[PDB]
Amino acid sequence: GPHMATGQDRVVALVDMDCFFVQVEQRQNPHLRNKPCAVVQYKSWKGGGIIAVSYEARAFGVTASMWADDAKKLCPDLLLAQVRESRGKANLTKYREASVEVMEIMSRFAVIERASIDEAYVDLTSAVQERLQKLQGQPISADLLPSTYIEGLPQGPTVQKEGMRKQGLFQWLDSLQIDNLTSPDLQLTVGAVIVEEMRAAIERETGFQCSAGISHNKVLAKLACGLNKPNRQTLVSHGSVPQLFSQMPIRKIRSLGGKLGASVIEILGIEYMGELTQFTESQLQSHFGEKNGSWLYAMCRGIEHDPVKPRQLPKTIGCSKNFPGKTALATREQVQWWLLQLAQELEERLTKDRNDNDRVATQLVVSIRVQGDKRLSSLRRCCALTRYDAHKMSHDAFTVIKNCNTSGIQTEWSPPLTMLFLCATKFSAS
DNA sequence: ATTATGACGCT
DNA sequence: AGCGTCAT
Numbered sequence: 001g002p003h004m005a006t007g008q009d010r011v012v013a014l015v016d017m018d019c020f021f022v023q024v025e026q027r028q029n030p031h032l033r034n035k036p037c038a039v040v041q042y043k044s045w046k047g048g049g050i051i052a053v054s055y056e057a058r059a060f061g062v063t064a065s066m067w068a069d070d071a072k073k074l075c076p077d078l079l080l081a082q083v084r085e086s087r088g089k090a091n092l093t094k095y096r097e098a099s100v101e102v103m104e105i106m107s108r109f110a111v112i113e114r115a116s117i118d119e120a121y122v123d124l125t126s127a128v129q130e131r132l133q134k135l136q137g138q139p140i141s142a143d144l145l146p147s148t149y150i151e152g153l154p155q156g157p158t159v160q161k162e163g164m165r166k167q168g169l170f171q172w173l174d175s176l177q178i179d180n181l182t183s184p185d186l187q188l189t190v191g192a193v194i195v196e197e198m199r200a201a202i203e204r205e206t207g208f209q210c211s212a213g214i215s216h217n218k219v220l221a222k223l224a225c226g227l228n229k230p231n232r233q234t235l236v237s238h239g240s241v242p243q244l245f246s247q248m249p250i251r252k253i254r255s256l257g258g259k260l261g262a263s264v265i266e267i268l269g270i271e272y273m274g275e276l277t278q279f280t281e282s283q284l285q286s287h288f289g290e291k292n293g294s295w296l297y298a299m300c301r302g303i304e305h306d307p308v309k310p311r312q313l314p315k316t317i318g319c320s321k322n323f324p325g326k327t328a329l330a331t332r333e334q335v336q337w338w339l340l341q342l343a344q345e346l347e348e349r350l351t352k353d354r355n356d357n358d359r360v361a362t363q364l365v366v367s368i369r370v371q372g373d374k375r376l377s378s379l380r381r382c383c384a385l386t387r388y389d390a391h392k393m394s395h396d397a398f399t400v401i402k403n404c405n406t407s408g409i410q411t412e413w414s415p416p417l418t419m420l421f422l423c424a425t426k427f428s429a430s
Numbered sequence: 431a432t433t434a435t436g437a438c439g440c441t
Numbered sequence: 442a443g444c445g446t447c448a449t
């Protein structure tokens with residue numbers, strides 16, 4: 001009762017750019033705007049691999065992880081933009097720089113955690129408190145929430161999509177004004193007002209649209225964000241959780257989309273997140289470990305405590321290339337040439353990072369895959385990164401992996417290498 | 431023959 | 442440390 005924590009202490013948002021690499025290419029090339037289009041890397045094998053898809057193209061069934069030749073079967077008029085190639089490899093700089101544009105705007109509003117190239121969590125608790133003081137008990141108008149969905153509403157005693165959105169928003173605001181909701185509900189609502197403002201600023205200042213979720217923690221904000229995409233935001237209140245979770249497949253919750261989630265389903269014989277509430281904390285810990293068990297026990301009740309970390313910059317800077325099928329690296333000089341290409345891109349990015357962000361990487365991680373290996377990485381070795389110099393880094397990388405070569409002929413490399421990976425890590429202030 | 435990333439957990 | 446999981 002009175003001592004039962006409800007995980008309603010924070011306001012957290014997750015902002016997720018819509019079709020991000022496609023928007024970056026559409027801003028650059030107006031011919032691609034409002035068209036079925038996709039971003040592809042490379043072109044020779046089956047037309048290239050699709051890595052991002054506009055919503056117009058998704059209507060035809062085009063997805064990422066599709067070959068462009070196959071996407072064209074579904075959507076013959078699909079437009080394509082190619083990822084830049086430099087030094088023999090795909091180069092993602094344009095998208096990393098577009099990411100910085102958005103992250104810097106978000107940072108004006110609040111502390112953010114960079115979750116990926118186009119996702120950031122936002123801790124809005126303090127901003128909401130501030131806005132509430134400005135507001136002075138003045139009610140919140142629907143006009144302040146023009147792209148907001150309230151999950152679970154409308155309900156109870158119009159067949160258009162926007163009409164439904166407004167009906168739900170009206171019910172929510174009507175209740176807030178009549179004092180039939182909770183202080184956490186008001187906090188979330190003010191959070192959503194701020195996120196409208198944030199999303200408007202992103203679009204104004206970059207041209208890019210995004211979706212967002214607002215809730216009391218990162219997992220619910222992420223779940224919320226996906227409910228209404230694209231170009232919309234969704235508020236998931238604490239009270240919405242029992243209905244929302246009652247039919248929510250376990251794999252939809254972040255961290256449960258893989259083997260752990262499959263084990264939860266199999267071991268417990270359940271399908272939906274809400275079904276977890278019937279187990280004790282000890283029962284869950286007994287199957288999934290102390291940490292996972294406690295996390296699951298709280299999470300299925302809508303409670304999570306993972307903080308929004310104050311981190312706007314990536315912690316690592318890496319460069320990798322696959323060498324599939326017949327293109328696997330089978331000679332010494334091949335391996336060395338590609339290590340150099342990778343090291344040259346890495347040096348370029350590191351030098352920029354050092355100038356921009358007042359830090360230096362101190363460790364170089366070298367990873368390879370060998371042909372036949374089940375896993376993405378076969379071997380990982382570290383060495384010191386003491387100089388931002390591509391020839392040195394590439395020579396050092398060779399040294400730490402050269403003994404993986406089974407070949408008696410040192411000119412040859414066996415078994416052939418199907419992946420090379422260089423990663424700069426362990427930053428120190430500079 | 432998805433590819434190129436990136437954070438965090440385990441022992 | 443080196444490996445594995447989960448995610449954009």
Ligand SMILES: Nc1ncnc2c1ncn2[C@H]1C[C@H](O)[C@@H](COP(=O)(O)OP(=O)(O)OP(=O)(O)O)O1
Nearest residue numbers: 016017018019020021022051052053117118434449
């Ligand atoms: N598996 C991947 N391989 C390479 N690039 C990827 C991969 N997944 C995502 N990306 C890139 C391209 C995406 O535009 C960008 C952001 O990813 P993501 O949020 O999953 O999709 P998206 O922004 O294209 O569409 P959505 O509107 O559904 O969010 O990161």
Ligand SMILES: [Ca+2]
Nearest residue numbers: 016017018019
């Ligand atoms: Ca996205």
Ligand SMILES: [K+]
Nearest residue numbers: 016116118119
């Ligand atoms: K994303």
